[PDB]
């Protein structure tokens, strides 16, 4: 009644792992499908597409470790718990608590980075993989130039040593989260989002500890995550799992390169398509996004 | 605020784009000194007295900085492009009767300086630049490692009001964080506390902070375009030039400075100095001696 329930019919679950609890909304029946959000959002970003997927799947809509209502494991000097390798291990443990050792996976933004790292580390856990509006972390850094440095400035700003980004973000947190939501949409304002969802994102961003977690995520993104990707690309390791890459016609991924061509170097069985949308596919273009996921996973 | 230039006069120079504030001392050939970010003219307070023994020293606040007036900006950040700043400083010097002068700049002021030399070389007898490479070269070498080192080049260039709103929460923190982080020691020990107060009070004005972002916005767009035309056309600076850099400073993170400046200038000398970014305050005696020797 403070924050709205945007998943009518879904249960709420607190799933224990050795690193802390994962919060998730659970609905539907059939094969299991895990959906992962990214920055600066929570699990509620899937509220327009999850009911359509729940017609054929058991849908598990989870807050990433340290995000939303999931617990925040204590970080260290190498940002270990917020590396995508560690987040993937934690979510594998969460799914085992529900009896799911082989599942389908779709991720957006940071959640898509957890997802492809999971596929490289533990491919036997996945039946099929979908990533929304990303290229691998290694590719963003290797294509770093003037134009991309300006477009994804937050990759270098949020990775500065603590407490610099934390202190600046505290300067106007409501403004910052709303500016990020609006600036990455095709419309350029907040009119694509459900106002009740925006309230979820604004409340999460209001907590200083939650903002610190997000900075640790981006710190890992500039250091350990990049090194982990570098090992795979220099060894020629590919994702063996069937994979779908979706991206926004005016999103982030298409600024760096031709997404489907990039992912071919990283995966052996990948298909893709553009969606008429900005970065936030499931909220800007929910019907097209759900159609493409339904067809791919079934 | 303390007077850190005993014996220097104070001048308010009129130009078409607003007044320039400057301290003036000494006697001899004219020498203009320009500061950068996030500082004011007082950064020269340890070096200008040595220079004043031999030169007519003019220590100016950049357009929009310190006590100089703030021309209103536009959608292309025109008044805070280095081309425009150079033109405004040429007019200021003409008001004093100086149509041919020597010039030394640090940080943003060094970028005004080398742009002045490319646009209007006949105005300069000699030029010195401290701890910079040309703006084009910073952007051309912007890889992962450098993007993390000079993140503020992309953060402060974001569209208004995003940097301004974040800086407004705790301005004192950000200005001191930047002063500390670019010194060799990593703290504020190298600065005179009275000079830090000057920089802190300037940064506390929201209009002054907006100007600094407009300067960085020009640095990401029009300044880069202007440099790109010159380098792709093979236009080199013909003025005799000195490039000084800190061994722990910013310029040497991207590349070997002297090799880069030889691409941009036909008569360049260069020397490292054991210092962070803030040469005139971290290494005053070495900096002053290098300048006196070059300009004489």
User: Does any CB of chain A come closer than 8 Å to the CB of residue B9?
Assistant: no
| Among chain A residues, CA nearest to B170 | A171
Counting DSSP H helices and E strands in chain A, the numbers are: 15, 8
Nearest CA distance, B13 vs chain A (angstrom): 36
User: Does any CB of chain A come closer than 8 Å to the CB of residue B221?
Assistant: no
- Among candidate residues B53, B42, B45, B40, the one with its CA nearest the CA of residue B202: B40
Q: Is A43 among the residues known to form the active site? A: no
- The rounded distance, in Å, linking the Cα atoms of A217 and A108 is 15
Nearest CA distance, A237 vs chain B (angstrom): 23
- The rounded distance, in Å, linking the Cα atoms of B201 and B1 is 9
| Among chain B residues, CA nearest to A146 | B139
B139 annotated among ligand-binding-site residues: no
The CATH number of the domain holding residue A268 is: 3.40.50.1820
Q: Is A109 among the residues known to form the active site? A: yes
3-state helix, strand and coil shares in percent for chain A, rounded to the nearest 5: 45, 15, 40
Which tokens is B294 given?
A: 């070059």
B54 annotated among ligand-binding-site residues: no
User: Does any CB of chain B come closer than 8 Å to the CB of residue A226?
Assistant: yes
- The rounded distance, in Å, linking the Cα atoms of A29 and B75 is 55
> Residue B118 contacts by C-beta under 8 Å, 6 or more apart in sequence?
B230, B235, B237
User: Does any CB of chain A come closer than 8 Å to the CB of residue B162?
Assistant: yes
B261 annotated among ligand-binding-site residues: no
Kindly list the residues from chain A whose CB atom is less than 8 angstroms away from the CB atom of residue B144: 141-142, 144, 222, 226
Q: How many domains is chain B built from?
A: 1
Q: What is the DSSP string of chain B?
A: ----STT-EEEEE--TT--EEEEEEE-SSEEEEE--TT--GGGGTTTHHHHHTTSEEEEEPPTTSTTS------TT-GGGSHHHHHHHHHHHHHHTT-SSEEEEEETHHHHHHHHHHHH-GGGEEEEEEES---HHHHHHT--HHHHHHTTHHHHTTSPTTHHHHHHTT-HHHHHHHHHHHTSSSSSSTTS-HHHHHHHHHHHT-HHHHHHHHHHHHHHHTHHHHHHHHHHHHT--B-S-EEEEEETTSSHHHHS-HHHHHHHHBSSEEEEEESS-S-HHHHSHHHHHHHHHHHH-
Backbone breaks in chain A after residues (C–N over 2.5 Å)? none
Residue that the structure tokens 């030394």 belong to: B104
- The rounded distance, in Å, linking the Cα atoms of A274 and A111 is 19
Q: Which domain holds residue A78?
A: 1-298
This entry's atomic model was obtained through X-ray
Kindly list the residues from chain B whose CB atom is less than 8 angstroms away from the CB atom of residue A141: 144
- Among candidate residues B40, B46, B43, B6, the one with its CA nearest the CA of residue B26: B6
CA atoms within 13 Å, Cβ hemisphere of A34:
32
């Amino acid at each position: 009644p403070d924050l709205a329930d945007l998943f009518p019919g879904f249960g709420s679950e607190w799933i224990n792992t050795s690193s802390g609890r994962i919060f998730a909304r659970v609905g539907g029946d059939g094969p299991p499908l895990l959906l992962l959000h990214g920055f600066p959002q929570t699990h509620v970003m899937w509220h327009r597409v999850a009911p359509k997927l729940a017609e054929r799947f058991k849908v598990i809509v989870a807050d990433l470790p340290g995000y939303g209502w999931s617990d925040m494991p204590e970080s260290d000097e190498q940002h270990t718990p917020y590396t995508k390798r560690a987040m993937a291990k934690q979510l594998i443990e969460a799914m085992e608590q529900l009896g799911h050792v082989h599942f389908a996976l779709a991720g957006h933004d940071r959640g898509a980075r957890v997802s492809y790292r999971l596929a490289l580390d533990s491919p036997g856990r996945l039946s099929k993989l979908a990533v929304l509006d990303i290229l691998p972390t290694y590719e963003y850094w290797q294509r770093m130039n003037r134009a991309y440095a300006l477009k994804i400035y937050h990759w270098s700003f949020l990775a500065q040593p603590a407490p610099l980004p934390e202190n600046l973000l505290g300067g106007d947190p409501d403004f910052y989260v709303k500016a990020k939501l609006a600036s990455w949409t095709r419309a350029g304002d907040l009119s694509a989002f459900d106002p009740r969802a925006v309230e979820h994102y604004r409340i999460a961003f209001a907590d200083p500890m939650r903002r610190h977690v997000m900075c640790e995520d981006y710190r890992a993104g500039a250091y350990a995550d990049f090194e982990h990707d570098k090992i795979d690309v220099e060894a020629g390791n590919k994702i063996p799992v069937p994979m779908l890459a979706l991206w926004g016609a005016s999103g982030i991924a298409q600024s760096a390169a031709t997404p489907l061509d990039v992912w071919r170097k990283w995966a052996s069985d990948v298909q893709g398509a553009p969606i008429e949308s900005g970065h936030f596919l499931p909220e800007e273009a929910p019907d097209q996004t759900a159609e493409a996921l339904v067809r791919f996973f079934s």
